[PDB]
Design an enzyme around this catalytic site. Sequence first.
Site, PDB file in Angstrom:
ATOM      1  N   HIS A 351       0.766  -1.254   0.000  1.00 19.72           N
ATOM      2  CA  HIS A 351       0.000   0.000   0.000  1.00 19.72           C
ATOM      3  C   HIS A 351       0.796   1.303   0.000  1.00 19.72           C
ATOM      4  CE1 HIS A 351      -3.866  -1.929   1.214  1.00 19.72           C
ATOM      5  NE2 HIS A 351      -3.031  -2.837   1.710  1.00 19.72           N
ATOM      6  N   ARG A 543      -5.867  12.073   6.823  1.00 19.75           N
ATOM      7  CA  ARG A 543      -4.797  12.291   7.815  1.00 19.75           C
ATOM      8  C   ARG A 543      -3.874  13.461   7.419  1.00 19.75           C
ATOM      9  NH1 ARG A 543      -4.016   8.158  11.911  1.00 19.75           N
ATOM     10  NH2 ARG A 543      -2.391   9.683  12.528  1.00 19.75           N
ATOM     11  N   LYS A 548       0.470  14.658   1.620  1.00 23.19           N
ATOM     12  CA  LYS A 548      -0.910  14.971   1.221  1.00 23.19           C
ATOM     13  C   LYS A 548      -1.132  16.496   0.939  1.00 23.19           C
ATOM     14  CE  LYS A 548      -2.780  10.885   3.652  1.00 23.19           C
ATOM     15  NZ  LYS A 548      -3.835  10.328   2.735  1.00 23.19           N
ATOM     16  N   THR A 650      -8.711   6.755  -1.215  1.00 26.01           N
ATOM     17  CA  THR A 650     -10.080   6.302  -1.352  1.00 26.01           C
ATOM     18  C   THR A 650     -11.092   7.375  -0.989  1.00 26.01           C
ATOM     19  OG1 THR A 650      -9.911   5.359   0.808  1.00 26.01           O
ATOM     20  CG2 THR A 650      -9.580   3.854  -1.048  1.00 26.01           C
TER      21      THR A 650
HETATM   22  N1  LIG Z   1      -1.632   5.941   1.729  1.00 21.04           N
HETATM   23  C1  LIG Z   1      -2.373   4.729   1.233  1.00 21.04           C
HETATM   24  C2  LIG Z   1      -3.548   5.108   0.358  1.00 21.04           C
HETATM   25  O1  LIG Z   1      -3.165   5.825  -0.879  1.00 21.04           O
HETATM   26  C3  LIG Z   1      -4.361   3.926   0.023  1.00 21.04           C
HETATM   27  O2  LIG Z   1      -5.521   4.464  -0.624  1.00 21.04           O
HETATM   28  C4  LIG Z   1      -4.835   3.122   1.274  1.00 21.04           C
HETATM   29  C5  LIG Z   1      -5.515   1.768   0.957  1.00 21.04           C
HETATM   30  O3  LIG Z   1      -4.828   1.027  -0.005  1.00 21.04           O
HETATM   31  O4  LIG Z   1      -3.708   2.773   2.123  1.00 21.04           O
HETATM   32  C6  LIG Z   1      -2.876   3.924   2.461  1.00 21.04           C
HETATM   33  C7  LIG Z   1      -1.738   3.411   3.305  1.00 21.04           C
HETATM   34  N2  LIG Z   1      -1.749   3.328   4.642  1.00 21.04           N
HETATM   35  C8  LIG Z   1      -0.556   2.849   5.038  1.00 21.04           C
HETATM   36  C9  LIG Z   1      -0.071   2.539   6.481  1.00 21.04           C
HETATM   37  C10 LIG Z   1      -0.973   2.586   7.570  1.00 21.04           C
HETATM   38  C11 LIG Z   1      -0.532   2.235   8.873  1.00 21.04           C
HETATM   39  C12 LIG Z   1       0.839   1.827   9.048  1.00 21.04           C
HETATM   40  C13 LIG Z   1       1.304   1.480  10.344  1.00 21.04           C
HETATM   41  C14 LIG Z   1       2.648   1.088  10.512  1.00 21.04           C
HETATM   42  C15 LIG Z   1       3.556   1.029   9.437  1.00 21.04           C
HETATM   43  C16 LIG Z   1       3.099   1.379   8.149  1.00 21.04           C
HETATM   44  C17 LIG Z   1       1.724   1.782   7.966  1.00 21.04           C
HETATM   45  C18 LIG Z   1       1.273   2.123   6.653  1.00 21.04           C
HETATM   46  N3  LIG Z   1       0.123   2.558   3.941  1.00 21.04           N
HETATM   47  N4  LIG Z   1      -0.592   2.921   2.876  1.00 21.04           N
HETATM   48  C1  LIG Z   2     -11.860   7.142   3.230  1.00 21.36           C
HETATM   49  C2  LIG Z   2     -11.265   7.601   4.554  1.00 21.36           C
HETATM   50  C3  LIG Z   2      -9.826   7.881   4.684  1.00 21.36           C
HETATM   51  C4  LIG Z   2      -8.845   7.759   3.530  1.00 21.36           C
HETATM   52  O1  LIG Z   2      -8.918   8.994   2.935  1.00 21.36           O
HETATM   53  P1  LIG Z   2      -7.807   9.449   1.856  1.00 21.36           P
HETATM   54  O2  LIG Z   2      -8.370  10.705   1.320  1.00 21.36           O
HETATM   55  O3  LIG Z   2      -7.720   8.325   0.805  1.00 21.36           O
HETATM   56  O4  LIG Z   2      -6.493   9.664   2.641  1.00 21.36           O
HETATM   57  C5  LIG Z   2      -9.269   8.254   5.901  1.00 21.36           C
HETATM   58  N1  LIG Z   2     -10.088   8.382   6.961  1.00 21.36           N
HETATM   59  C6  LIG Z   2     -11.414   8.176   6.966  1.00 21.36           C
HETATM   60  C7  LIG Z   2     -12.145   8.433   8.228  1.00 21.36           C
HETATM   61  C8  LIG Z   2     -12.096   7.713   5.743  1.00 21.36           C
HETATM   62  O5  LIG Z   2     -13.477   7.509   5.695  1.00 21.36           O
END
Ligand SMILES: N[C@@H]1[C@@H](O)[C@H](O)[C@@H](CO)O[C@H]1c1nc(-c2ccc3ccccc3c2)n[nH]1
Ligand SMILES: *Cc1c(COP(=O)(O)O)cnc(C)c1O
Lengths: 810, 810
Positions: A351, A543, A548, A650
């Site tokens: 991701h 976030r 972003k 998303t």
């Molecule tokens: N930033 C991406 C986003 O573009 C994508 O739409 C979404 C679902 O595929 O995932 C997001 C994303 N979250 C994380 C993430 C979240 C929590 C974590 C905790 C510890 C270490 C790494 C971590 C990485 N990566 N990608």
């Molecule tokens: C959909 C959603 C996200 C992910 O949003 P992005 O614009 O893709 O970063 C984060 N938080 C909440 C509460 C959501 O509903």
Amino acid sequence: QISVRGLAGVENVTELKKNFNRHLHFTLVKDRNVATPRDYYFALAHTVRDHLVGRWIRTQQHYYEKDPKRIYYLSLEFYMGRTLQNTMVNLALENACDEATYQLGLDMEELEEIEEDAGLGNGGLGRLAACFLDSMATLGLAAYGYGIRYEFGIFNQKICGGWQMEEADDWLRYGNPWEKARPEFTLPVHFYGRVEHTSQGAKWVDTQVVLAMPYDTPVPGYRNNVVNTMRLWSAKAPNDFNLGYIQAVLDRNLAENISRVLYPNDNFFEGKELRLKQEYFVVAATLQDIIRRFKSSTNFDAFPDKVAIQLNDTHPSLAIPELMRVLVDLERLDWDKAWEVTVKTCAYTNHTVLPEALERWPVHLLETLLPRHLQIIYEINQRFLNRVAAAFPGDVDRLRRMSLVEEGAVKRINMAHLCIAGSHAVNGVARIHSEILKKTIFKDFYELEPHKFQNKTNGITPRRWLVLCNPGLAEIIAERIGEEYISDLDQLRKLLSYVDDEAFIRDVAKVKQENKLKFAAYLEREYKVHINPNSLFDVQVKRIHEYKRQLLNCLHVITLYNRIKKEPNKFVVPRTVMIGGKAAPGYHMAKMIIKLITAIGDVVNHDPVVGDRLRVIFLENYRVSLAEKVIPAADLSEQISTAGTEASGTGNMKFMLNGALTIGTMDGANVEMAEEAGEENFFIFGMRVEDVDRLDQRGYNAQEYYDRIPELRQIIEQLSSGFFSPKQPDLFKDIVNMLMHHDRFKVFADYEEYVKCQERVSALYKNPREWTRMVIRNIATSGKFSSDRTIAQYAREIWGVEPSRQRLPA
Amino acid sequence: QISVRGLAGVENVTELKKNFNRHLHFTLVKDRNVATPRDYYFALAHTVRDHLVGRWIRTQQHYYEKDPKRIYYLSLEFYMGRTLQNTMVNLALENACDEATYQLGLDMEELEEIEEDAGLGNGGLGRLAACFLDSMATLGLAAYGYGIRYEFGIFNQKICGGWQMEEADDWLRYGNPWEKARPEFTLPVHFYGRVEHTSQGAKWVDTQVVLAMPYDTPVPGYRNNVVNTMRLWSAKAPNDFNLGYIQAVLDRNLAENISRVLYPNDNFFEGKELRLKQEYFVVAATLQDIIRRFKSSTNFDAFPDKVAIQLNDTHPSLAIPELMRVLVDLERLDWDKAWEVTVKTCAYTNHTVLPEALERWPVHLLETLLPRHLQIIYEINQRFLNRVAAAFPGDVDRLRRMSLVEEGAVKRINMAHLCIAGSHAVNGVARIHSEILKKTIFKDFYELEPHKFQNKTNGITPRRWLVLCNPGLAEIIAERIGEEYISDLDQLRKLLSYVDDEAFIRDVAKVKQENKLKFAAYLEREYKVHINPNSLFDVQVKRIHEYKRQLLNCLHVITLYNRIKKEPNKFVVPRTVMIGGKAAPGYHMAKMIIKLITAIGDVVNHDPVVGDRLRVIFLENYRVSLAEKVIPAADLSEQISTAGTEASGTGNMKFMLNGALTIGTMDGANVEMAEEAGEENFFIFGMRVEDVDRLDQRGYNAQEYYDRIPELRQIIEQLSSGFFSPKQPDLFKDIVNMLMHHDRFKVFADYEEYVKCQERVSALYKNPREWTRMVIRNIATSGKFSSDRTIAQYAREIWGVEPSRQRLPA
Ligand SMILES: N[C@@H]1[C@@H](O)[C@H](O)[C@@H](CO)O[C@H]1c1nc(-c2ccc3ccccc3c2)n[nH]1
Ligand SMILES: *Cc1c(COP(=O)(O)O)cnc(C)c1O
Ligand SMILES: N[C@@H]1[C@@H](O)[C@H](O)[C@@H](CO)O[C@H]1c1nc(-c2ccc3ccccc3c2)n[nH]1
Ligand SMILES: *Cc1c(COP(=O)(O)O)cnc(C)c1O
């Protein structure tokens, strides 16, 4: 009252009321004179949970008798939000509960608001897990989500003096009527110990034992009578644990801390032990459960025909060495057979490509904590590197780059490499992201094993993200084309032939207006703030992160402000600029950005010259249930990450579904969204991926933009000199500094094209009819971004399973 | 099947089954093919809890409308045991549930055994609290028990190698269907801080806040449709608590530790901070609740007409300064009016005269933790000592002895003195104990305020301690005299005219035999051990303590053993000697005694010469639910504490009720038991109180007994030389040593008279008919020891409330 909310039959209604009073007396032990709204929410929650039960038992039954292949979705995050409305929607109870509650003189909508968000995730990743569950249930797949039942979810965000304060999200305080504790399927998990060798083989001994106790949550399908399970593990000490006396008992906390709290970093790795314990805990207890369920069908060859394990990023990557440990050390298969079994079972979704989000665990950590898994990892590595050597003889550098073991001051295991080695499929999460994986980050892996690499662009469920949060738009759509689109979102294309229907144009615009009115009041009531609802609703909710680029948005905001002040008597399309999101607790810069935003709000919202032409609102505590309110209300969706940094996104899809236009860069799924709607129907601006790379080669010099763009220079000077912080004139020095000397995300590079593109949005807002025809063109082509499409693609191209839409019996 | 178990009406039975299947499907989410017995216990528990609900709501209702005076029973202990059978008994459901479950082909008795003891007490004191609750409900009093909902109750006792091991009593692991969480009545409790003075008055500031969240448990009356409440507080951290981030959340444990674990010392003070926090926590949250309930009736004069607060020993003695704090610092009454209110509200029950059980808190502790309460205590003390000075001018020594503040290396507050100063009544718990209070420990207080001192001899509830644990004896009694005795135990005297009825003699003896058979099998099944059930059942069950003199019993045991070995071919009445009880975890000597007992068992039970003439069984994990099984099975009850050390005892009463003869000293309530049955009907031996005192004056020399009694000398030599521990010959040196040089409890003084008295018991056991006529004489005069008698005496002579036996409507 509205038809997508199902039937309100005289028998149903009578029955719901009867059961509502039953639970209030018997479950809640209250009478009608002492009941609080919390009590009424509860009695309604037990009444709806009653409708799930027979369906849940029957579904679990049917999977035992049909024995289909089972999917295990492993994630450390599941961002669920509220359950009550979702359950009603999926069981077609919404109108009857509405009626039942009305006749007891209660307002359902008011009761719904008492339910706590299950906030067991950080943002996009945990929320994708949730959408996926709803889609798996709706597609009839025999699927189980597995995770950790955290006692504390993502913290609640307070603003004080324009700063983020964090409070513990104590979501279970009042109980969770949705979960069923199953203390009978409690399973041991082992930690520490050492490895001995016998004539028998390796043996993991002298371990600490922590118990994993599962809680089951029903996941109902969309009107199909399928109800799947989300199983979440809780840590419990064993009873001989430690066992002067008092202290032994009090020290049971050290084991149960494993499930105490969600780590709150979005898209950022922090290598703490407690986190690695969390990852092993969910992997160990789940694999035993998976294996136990397989033995009720000697023979592990059939295991990949009966089990798919999907890994949500690398967070459960220990599934791979754990599966090996079980098969080799406990089941006594030889290495190669075990390995074939594992690779065919496991699939990995990546991701992110941000290097600071990639999990790389120190060796000394795995050696104390999981010493057998470290042995297995090395053995995996050696054998993998022998395949690399035979395919690329002499390419020594390839070997070093491809190792699961990073050399360096501190040796690390690259968990992403482990995932690619031990999975039959590796997918990214939008097309451009999947292409970047094959071209840069995992180019070497892809040359070795081209056949493993796939794309599966993300989607969102339209049940929560349209039917549920936006009943009016759902309804005017159903008024024209029927209800069938709700589980077949491609059907929304039929809406193109209504793009010049005057009555449709009017209805789309009226629903938007009603949502704006409803959200504008919710601002007034819950947070005493006044917005003009004729203004354009410019929202950026996600976030808080440097990539972003909420900071880009701030620059635009300040520009509009400066323009109004230069020519105060000129017309300007009024805007309400709303920005919301949590910052990770130790991410100092994200915390400063929140501060900059509110500081801009203090200047802008109190300028009498501004009038109500420009408002800047920071939306406190952004979470799933606040997304449900603001997203239907948005006119303009801000998706403005530097090209190549947002994996998919998303939120972008949520807004396309709900009647907002998008201003965005060619990043993540914005690229596919634009291609589905037509580039004319989208506000595309900024560097492409290719442009960012050209910039990286000659070097990004922010000074050049500051000298060439007077409007940019005024803003930096204002930030610098204390325009926005008159009591601490240097409060923003870190922000200015980063922007000028150390900006990884090229905020100035995109500024000039962003402001121009923002002028084109204002020009179209001036023409309501054309704004709305374009909105129609977006909503009409948002079909692809249904998570049903995404899951049907996982099912066919990775899991080897056919989705069905056929109802189980009632 | 038996008539005291109520009616099994065709409608009731049909209804219970219908609801049993409803809860299994809906509450438990199980079907009939996957259900474990634990599930069946649960569905039965929710079905019975359903019958309590309307009664509970209606009772709480009626108290609001009638507004009677309310009693608050404050205890740190409530030793409840199981709830299911008790609830059935009290609602007259026992036969119908039996029938309902039978027709689903389940055995109720087997389901009942799955329920965990609520072990929230140590022994007599917590168990008295429980009996009192049942009696208050049966007597129609508007009464509330208040305590702490400990996550861990009294530890489970394992034996390994004949030693006590402790395991955490994780009684909530599977949930408690009996409690109703009331998170809406959560109340702040304050700790630490400092005191400032204003023109306004004193003010307690900068405190830590811990939240108290109440759990309510129904307490049903005996067939009267009254259901009272036991409210138990749980500690919860506030959410801003501590609030780098992760650690703040994990540190919420330090506040919730307050309710984590019961202190496991019976009749022994340990001055630890966590304990004082427990005492303040229950007092603070309760007083706010009491006060809130009073304000729904300005005026505190009526407060003592609306509220009685009974203190269970000194453990809640902080109620007194807390009540002052509220009235003075928050309600702004002057000192004297507040004081009058407090003294009229509070009453104190003393339960012990052992000086090591008396609570004396270090000043430096109260000063850090409760600095305002320490100010209030001093002010109380000064004013109290001024009343002593005016009544006894010049008696300087009286002043020093009566101070609430003990001088010494460490200054202490004597909590017992605080209780007498601030209560209108002080009672002991048997007549001889109440007399010792007035003559020794509180002689000074009694000369000042004779009118405060009372007696209220303890009782036991006959619902649990006869109807429930001994349905066969209950039934043969009801067969002769009716059912009315169950709430009027004095009616048992009518049994005297059956003392020469041949058929009654036969029935009493047959029930004893059946209980022996049933208990002898329970030994076989659950702990693989074989007893001869024609033997006499010599039982000593109670906490392990030096004053309770399990060691005397050991000496008798070893003597019988030595006699058999000298003359192996002589007749001897066979005995099964069963001794059971927990030792406090750090009480080394109590732990050695357990070891001595099992070591005697290893020698005695394996001697072939002994045959089955003598068995020694240590009964593992003694708890309420094991008392329910062994007590009906006992022939001889051992109540053998040194005269003047056992305050009352209540095990003694349990056995008188259930057909055992008593061998005991003139201690505690044994004195009243003997006087109710006639001294001829009791096996009285040993020093009286007066004799122990004569011994203390010339000095106890254990050597003198060792020289004069050859049979005693052989036993000491055997203990010494390793007869009982052949691998560690010196294992018992601490025991021998204590017995010879440092025995506070004069074990040898009583030995010779004890052995002789034990010979008289064996002589009567030889004549079944006369053993049983004497048993009849005991059961017949056990009426006084009903806790209904005790509570009706508290109600009339302390609380000022009339008990009624009149049913509320159904
Ligand atoms: N930033 C991406 C986003 O573009 C994508 O739409 C979404 C679902 O595929 O995932 C997001 C994303 N979250 C994380 C993430 C979240 C929590 C974590 C905790 C510890 C270490 C790494 C971590 C990485 N990566 N990608
Ligand atoms: C959909 C959603 C996200 C992910 O949003 P992005 O614009 O893709 O970063 C984060 N938080 C909440 C509460 C959501 O509903
Ligand atoms: N030993 C008495 C017993 O004779 C009496 O029958 C019973 C009920 O009145 O109470 C018993 C008793 N228990 C305690 C006790 C129990 C727990 C404690 C914890 C801390 C400090 C002191 C403590 C004192 N006293 N008396
Ligand atoms: C009655 C009882 C006691 C008190 O027994 P004594 O003989 O008075 O010390 C202790 N524990 C349990 C489990 C009881 O039922």
